[PDB]
């Protein structure tokens with residue numbers, strides 16, 4: 001689709017067998033989701049936002065469906081104020097910024 | 100342009116007669132720039148992201164060019180970790196997300 005920016009660009013995602021709403025975020029290097037369970041090994045990571053850093057769990061090779069489009073990549077899980085789809089997964093669904 | 104997301108979507112902006120680098124950020128509601136002088140009066144604002152909130156100065160109706168596209172709108176100034184062009188100005192320059 002073509003998504004305008006009048007409002008936050010929120011879409012439905014399927015991750016870990018769950019449906020969530022998430023923000024398509026070209027400013028985010030990484031994908032960060034609120035607390036949930038994910039399969040496999042993880043390792044801790046610190047990620048920095050406009051108000052400083054938070055600690056998250058990094059899970060690799062996680063399959064996600066983003067507004068109907070499948071991808072695989074790293075997903076960070078922690079106390080984020082918003083579910084965020086970052087560039088690591090936006091590239092995979094073919095998302096571009098156009099003007 | 101059509102900007103892919105394999106790297107950060109950084110562009111040159113011009114504000115106050117000076118060129119700066121800034122991030123085109125669909126996850127940002129507002130536009131925030133590192134400390135600089137702007138004309139007129141300012142209003143208080145708090146903006147929240149990962150990590151928490153920061154206090155910024157809100158300046159309205161500021162002339163800014165974004166990748167050569169002219170805009171006039173609200174620019175926040177404060178201790179942001181990065182110059183960010185948010186949706187208030189991305190809409191002015193006609194930007195969309197497409198996949």
Ligand SMILES: CC(C)(C)NC(=O)[C@@H]1CN(Cc2cccnc2)CCN1C[C@@H](O)C[C@@H](Cc1ccccc1)C(=O)N[C@H]1c2ccccc2C[C@H]1O
Pocket residue numbers: 023025026027028029030031032047048049050081082084086124125126127128129130131146147148149180181183185
């Ligand atoms: C991976 C992670 C998510 C941690 N990245 C970021 O937070 C990066 C940080 N960098 C910088 C960085 C920081 C540290 C280290 N390297 C890089 C600058 C750009 N942000 C991306 C932003 O788009 C993130 C959003 C998240 C959010 C959306 C809605 C509600 C809460 C949080 C963000 O912070 N947006 C906020 C925002 C942003 C600007 C102006 C106003 C507002 C309000 C709000 O929309």
Ligand SMILES: [Cl-]
Pocket residue numbers: 072073074088089
């Ligand atoms: Cl990845």
Ligand SMILES: [Cl-]
Pocket residue numbers: 094103
């Ligand atoms: Cl591509």
